[PDB]
Amino acid sequence: STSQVRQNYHQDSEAAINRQINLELYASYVYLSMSYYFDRDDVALKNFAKYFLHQSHEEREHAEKLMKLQNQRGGRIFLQDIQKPDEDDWESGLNAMEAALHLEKNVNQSLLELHKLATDKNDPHLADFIETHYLNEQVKAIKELGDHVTNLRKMGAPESGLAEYLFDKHTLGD
């Protein structure tokens, strides 16, 4: 019993996709936790909460789109525990943005290794899938998060509660 659709689909890549699914679900969990941190009455930054809730839902499509690809190529989904975030309390708008930047770089590095695995096993379809749906999305998220961390720092965060409040209204509100 091997899948009728399987073709040029190496098993290391199949396993790498299964790990990537867990990573994207994890990322979505991190964002879910950040968003409702900023919903706390003693944090109370509504657009920070909306911004991170949006990222969390985005990561959930990233996970589902990878699950879709596995079935398309004949792989078999095997899910694992979605490890809890490293933090329940994110201290500040700035820290959350700095933490988010770190998370997206780790997902990016696992995606770049997935692409190297695909090219090494000469699977051009999986590589093009990775280029089209993830690599440029990661570069845009990292840059945007970089832009955000720069601005919060120059406004005087995190020491300046006035800085985070104004960033919340003028950049994250739209």
Tell me the binding residues.
Answer: 24, 59, 62, 104, 138
Q: Residue 63 in 3-state DSSP? A: helix
Contact pattern from residue 118 through residue 137 relative to a copy of itself, giving x for each residue in contact according to CB under 8 A and a dash for the rest: -x--x-xx-xxxxxx--xx-
Q: Which residue is associated with the tokens 């930047």?
A: 101
Q: Distance (Å, rounded) from C-alpha 46 to C-alpha 39?
A: 6
For Fe ion, the binding residue among 62, 73, 115, 148 (CB under 5 A) is 62
- Of the two residues 86 and 128, which places its CB atom closer to Na ion in the complex? 128
Q: Which residue is associated with the tokens 């190496």?
A: 10
Does residue 79 touch a copy of itself according to CB under 8 A? yes
For a copy of itself, the binding residue among 82, 95, 110, 121 (CB under 8 A) is 82
Measured in whole angstroms, the distance separating CA 74 from the mean position of its chain's CA atoms is 25
Within 10 angstroms of residue 29's Cβ, the number of other Cβ atoms is 17
Does residue 54 touch a copy of itself according to CB under 8 A? no
- Of the two residues 106 and 132, which places its CB atom closer to Na ion in the complex? 132
- State the number of binding residues for a copy of itself (CB under 8 A): 86
Q: Which residue is associated with the tokens 């440029």?
A: 136
Angle (CA) 29-45-64 rounded to 5° is: 25
- Of the two residues 15 and 139, which places its CB atom closer to a copy of itself in the complex? 139
